[PDB]
Amino acid sequence: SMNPPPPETSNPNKPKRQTNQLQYLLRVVLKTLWKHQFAWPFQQPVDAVKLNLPDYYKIIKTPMDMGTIKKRLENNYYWNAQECIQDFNTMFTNCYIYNKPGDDIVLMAEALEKLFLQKINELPTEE
Ligand SMILES: Cc1cc(Nc2ccccc2C)n2cnnc2n1
Numbered sequence: 001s002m003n004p005p006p007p008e009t010s011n012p013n014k015p016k017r018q019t020n021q022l023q024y025l026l027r028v029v030l031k032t033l034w035k036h037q038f039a040w041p042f043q044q045p046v047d048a049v050k051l052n053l054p055d056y057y058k059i060i061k062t063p064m065d066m067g068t069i070k071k072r073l074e075n076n077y078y079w080n081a082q083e084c085i086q087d088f089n090t091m092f093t094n095c096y097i098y099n100k101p102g103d104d105i106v107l108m109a110e111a112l113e114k115l116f117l118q119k120i121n122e123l124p125t126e127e
Helices: 020-034 066-074 081-098 104-121
Strands: none
Touching: 020 066, 020 081, 020 104, 066 081, 081 104
16 A cells, blocks of 8 residues: 655666657657646656545556656666657556546556557657
């Protein structure tokens, strides 16, 4: 029923890159999803105490959220775009696994994921 420590967002010994694909993931992908009217439940780690979800972290072992992704992008945490893309997909998948079809939170994730898929379809060529 307790919250775990958050996912890692800083590690000075992890090698980093600044690339046009990662720039796109922040400037287009993250920004598009973040400003959406369904973003709010996804803008920070799931607070299982606040939301009375005592079994959430019993079930979900790789938590992920856009707050974490935002910090990772803004802090240059990643080596490549696929790392970041995986974080988004983990976020959506966690939601789908924990909840039931047609749940409000699932419909919200589905709408964000539709936008996500469109932007990723348009992922720029590597410079
Ligand atoms: C990503 C996510 C969020 C929530 N609940 C929620 C609702 C409103 C505001 C904040 C939060 C964290 N979830 C509830 N069950 N799975 C969930 N997944």
